[PDB]
Design a protein around this nucleic acid. Structure first.
Ligand SMILES: [Mg+2]
Ligand SMILES: [Mg+2]
Ligand SMILES: [Mg+2]
Ligand SMILES: [Mg+2]
Ligand SMILES: [Mg+2]
Ligand SMILES: [Mg+2]
Ligand SMILES: [Mg+2]
Ligand SMILES: [Mg+2]
Ligand SMILES: [Mg+2]
Ligand SMILES: [Mg+2]
Ligand SMILES: [Mg+2]
Ligand SMILES: [Mg+2]
Lengths: 100, 116, 59, 60, 131
RNA sequence: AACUGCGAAUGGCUCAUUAAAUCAGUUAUGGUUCCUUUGGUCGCUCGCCACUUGGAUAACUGUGGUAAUUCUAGA
RNA sequence: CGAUCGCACGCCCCCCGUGGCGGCGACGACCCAUUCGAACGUCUGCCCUAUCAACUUUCGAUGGUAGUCGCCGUGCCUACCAU
RNA sequence: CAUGGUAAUCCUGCUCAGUACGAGAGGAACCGCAGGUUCAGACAUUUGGUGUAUGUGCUUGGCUGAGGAGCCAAUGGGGCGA
RNA sequence: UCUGGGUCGGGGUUUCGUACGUAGCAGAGCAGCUCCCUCGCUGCGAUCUAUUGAAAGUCAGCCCUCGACACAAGGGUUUGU
């Protein structure tokens, strides 16, 4: 949830991370790509250099974090958004029939 | 958190998804995925495709008054002036009517006397 | 009150001209001193003698 | 941005120049002939609801 | 100021693209791209906003057998616009300019890419719409 | 000043088009329309405002936008 | 199937006493006629060229029937036929 | 960590600056900023490619009496595709 | 182990695009029955509409289960300052 988003959603995409599982503990969101497969152990290290360029020392303020399904062409950010857009289905109709 | 776009299928396209198509005649279209862009480019009608929101809307699938007059002052007659004029109901209007009646009567008698 | 916006009501430049509208404004029923109940606008410029101008009523 | 503010019950229209985008963000994403609360224009405009009658583009 | 970001090129040497101005030429055959240092066996390629050298194949005889500087204004290869939009056009098209980036023609048919428009102000003026 | 009405479809210019086309003479419209002028018709119908009914906008006052136009907005 | 405007203004007064009546116009009109026309047609008439002799007819060309459109007559257009 | 390998490169634009210099015409550079070229090492969120998930529709010829469900045609063909 | 990992099942995600059957006074039309009917009633008929964003697949290298089922203190070869 960014301050421009204010949605009760976690970093987990709709349907979980493909070939990893569900992220529950602390996480570090790094710019760009990282070596290794999914669920590969990585060592993070302090920079040996002095960060003086303008690319470094820049305040990164996120406006939006995508959480669509990565298991295909996901088009919804949350379960509730999907349900609100798509309305009741046959499964929910028979479930409400059983609940009464 | 950019502008939120809509597709061939009418679905919501979030930033970083889909492709934007700029036609030569100036029309700009955006699609959610290659399934939607293939249907559009093959001149397929979205109202005949059951998962499109245009179909679900065409087939109907799944789904003040007031009159306020504000009084204002005018040049020559203030709000109190027009109030005093319109509140002449208690017999003042009748007095004006009868004085007009006698003025007409005296004018007509004077006209008769002058003619004769 | 907003300063200079919601206060100091300004008057309309001119009142009703149709006799029906004068009667509607002044709650006249019928045939009571209509030509003298019309609003007369006073002109009082400094360089000229003051007078009051009455509009030509219609209908 | 400027605002041509008019109160028909008394006339006396006047122009108010507004610079802070936080004041105008309550106006943004609206249409003409829509009533919005002007409470974002400081305390002085609290209790005021105003209808967007029109305007002119950056080019006039 | 601002420098143009890298985009997908998709128009190598030997591409025949439409000529969108009212100059009188029908198409441009790209023979080289400006600023290409090059690499072995690699064809020089251009995207929108790039200045190419071109010869017109169909058009007026007084234009036909000559080399003209040209600028690409529309490409059919999809390119990413740094905000996540992947944009492509219905056809490849460019206009004929001089060495100063000033158009020989006086009008452009169809849209002009934003990357080309802000890079060439003279083309942006004659552009109908910007995509 | 502005609204309303009328005129602006006349005049003037040129001869590019145009070879039964235009055009000249002849005849027809019982196969059509027609501002205006002039002459007819306007109590010919049986059927709680009529001593006269409603609303809006100009002009006008005031606040503007635009570099710009015989551009115009809100009140 | 007149809710319009101007001009000098006058008659009746029993019932009364404030009303009812009047001339000259201007503007306005559904329709008819006239004027100005307009539009499409009737008959006849045009320069050179055969190193232009056969054209038109799929896509209206000629005609019929019934329509559409047009202010109106008409392949002006449509459908079906005849060639 | 002995030892061995070893890698980054070049250009453009803005600013400097219509500045230094120059009679004039012309016309730099250092710092800083924004991006590219060639190369390298990765990576798959996105866009694209693949696609026998032989996943799901469509479809030709034949075959199972027909329906339903399928199959065969050396991947039947084709659309979309995790 | 305060159990474990499997196999089915469920849910999520996602892919395709709306299943079979049934119903319809939807349907170009055509064919039979007329003491009937007074516009009928029986069929054939691609396709359409509703049930039905349905049906089907989805880890085999997708995500979460704590539902069901059995199974897991078993086996073999070596290794000493
Ligand atoms: Mg994915
Ligand atoms: Mg009058
Ligand atoms: Mg070679
Ligand atoms: Mg000529
Ligand atoms: Mg070393
Ligand atoms: Mg090296
Ligand atoms: Mg078959
Ligand atoms: Mg079958
Ligand atoms: Mg066999
Ligand atoms: Mg064989
Ligand atoms: Mg494909
Ligand atoms: Mg499962």
């Amino acid at each position: 949830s960014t301050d421009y988003d204010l949605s009760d959603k976690s970093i987990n995409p709709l349907g979980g991370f493909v070939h990893y599982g569900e992220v529950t503990n602390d996480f570090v969101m790094l710019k760009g790509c990282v070596v290794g497969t999914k669920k590969r152990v990585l060592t993070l290290r302090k920079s040996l250099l002095v960060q003086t360029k303008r690319r470094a020392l820049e305040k990164i303020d996120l406006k939006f974090i995508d959480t669509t399904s990565k298991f295909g062409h996901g088009r919804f950010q949350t379960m509730e958004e999907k349900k609100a857009f798509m309305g009741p289905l046959k499964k929910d109709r028979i479930a409400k029939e059983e609940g009464a | 958190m950019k502008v939120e776009l809509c597709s061939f299928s009418g679905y919501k396209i979030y930033p970083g998804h889909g492709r934007r198509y700029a036609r030569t005649d100036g029309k700009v279209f955006q699609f959610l995925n290659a399934k939607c862009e293939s249907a559009f480019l093959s001149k397929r009608n979205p109202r005949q495709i059951n998962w499109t929101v245009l179909y679900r809307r065409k087939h109907k699938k799944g789904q003040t008054r007031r009159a306020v007059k504000f009084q204002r002052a005018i040049t020559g007659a203030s709000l109190a002036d027009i109030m005093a004029k319109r509140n002449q109901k208690p017999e003042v209007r009748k007095a004006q009517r009868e004085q007009a009646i006698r003025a007409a009567k005296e004018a007509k008698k004077a006209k008769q006397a002058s003619k004769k | 009150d907003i300063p200079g916006l919601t206060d100091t009501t300004v008057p309309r430049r001119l009142g009703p001209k149709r006799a029906s509208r004068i009667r509607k404004l002044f709650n006249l029923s019928k045939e009571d001193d209509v030509r003298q109940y019309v609003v007369r606008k006073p002109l009082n410029k400094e360089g000229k003698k003051p007078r009051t101008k009455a509009p030509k009523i219609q209908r | 941005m400027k605002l041509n503010i008019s109160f028909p019950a008394t006339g006396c229209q006047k122009l108010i120049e507004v610079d802070d985008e936080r004041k105008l963000r309550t106006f943004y994403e609206k249409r003409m002939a829509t009533e919005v609360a002007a409470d974002a224009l400081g305390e002085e405009w609290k209790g005021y609801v105003v209808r967007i009658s029109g305007g002119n583009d950056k080019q006039g | 100021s601002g420098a143009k970001f890298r985009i997908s090129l998709g128009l190598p040497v030997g591409a025949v693209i439409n000529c969108a101005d009212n100059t009188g030429a029908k198409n441009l055959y790209i023979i080289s791209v400006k600023g290409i240092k090059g690499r072995l066996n690699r064809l020089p390629a251009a995207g929108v906003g790039d200045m190419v050298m071109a010869t017109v194949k169909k058009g007026k005889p007084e234009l036909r057998k000559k080399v003209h500087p040209a600028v690409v204004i529309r490409q059919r290869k999809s390119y990413r616009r740094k905000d996540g939009v992947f944009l492509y056009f219905e056809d490849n098209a460019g206009v004929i300019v001089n060495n100063k980036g000033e158009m020989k023609g006086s009008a452009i048919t169809g849209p002009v890419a934003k990357e080309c428009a802000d890079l060439w102000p003279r083309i942006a003026s004659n552009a109908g719409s910007i995509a």
